[PDB]
């Protein structure tokens with residue numbers, strides 16, 4: 001078929017599976033969330049918590065699906081249909097190494113639901129406690145062993161792909177042990193080889209040698225807020241892509257529709273980026289495509305705390321908060337606008 005509706009398997013949408021309901025999970029997990037103290041605001045702050053009631057959730061927006069559970073198979077079905085509408089072929093699943101049966105169950109449910117719609121799943125390896133290259137290797141082996149034969153498990157030219165958040169928290173000399181073909185605990189040329197995509201944060205003078213010396217296969221930028229980092233400043237993307245191409249690296253810039261996290265971080269208003277009825281998203285996605293990259297990542301499907309989600313949101317005013325909403329656009333606008341941009345990206349490939 002040549003209908004302009006098919007999934008794109010070089011488009012990665014960051015997905016969060018940490019939401020709970022009292023009925024399914026015992027608590028409205030993540031809809032309830034601690035409010036962060038101001039890191040510049042002195043001692044003795046008692047910032048409190050967002051209780052995750054119907055009226056007061058840990059987002060500046062409000063989900064069309066309500067306070068859902070990430071373990072509810074019927075929600076997962078709906079999410080996969082939303083991925084199909086957006087044309088995003090890869091679900092990049094947050095992974096926190098919780099080592100509990102509820103995590104294991106949820107990952108299996110997500111893989112199962114994804115496969116029904118031909119969506120693929122890769123893992124976004126988070127900064128879990130004591131993360132290091134040895135336990136990362138062990139965890140990569142675990143994930144490939146457990147899920148590598150699942151039909152929804154993502155591969156690119158035969159290799160799994162992982163995104164590594166805050167990869168700068170680990171020295172390049174440690175990464176080399178895992179990621180150089182000569183490394184002490186290498187994955188290269190093993191059953192557990194993978195494309196390892198690190199987080200490019202700051203300036204080229206720091207990041208270029210980091211990425212080379214760490215032996216990452218590529219890099220992504222994550223932040224939905226333009227200008228938050230050098231890497232999330234889209235006017236740098238042409239030159240970042242040029243460097244990537246010259247050095248055999250895969251650049252996967254991250255684009256998002258906006259940013260706002262002031263329910264959970266009231267002091268963080270400088271990071272707000274307004275959606276302007278889609279114009280912000282359009283501008284960022286256009287910059288990614290113009291940079292001539294081979295793959296794009298989307299921040300986010302459903303990071304509701306940070307207001308970067310493309311998942312449908314609805315107008316809501318409760319006694320406790322007046323939520324933001326998609327304004328002049330319909331709840332599914334960011335899904336269908338994603339599909340538009342995936343088409344323009346494919347036209348460019």
Ligand SMILES: OC[C@H]1C[C@H]2O[C@H]2[C@@H](O[C@H]2O[C@H](CO)[C@@H](O)[C@H](O)[C@H]2O)[C@@H]1O
Nearest residue numbers: 033094124126127165261264303305306
């Ligand atoms: O997925 C990578 C990274 C993106 C963004 O979700 C944050 C971050 O998690 C931190 O912040 C959220 C609040 O927005 C907290 O709920 C998490 O506990 C915290 O780790 C995430 O690592």
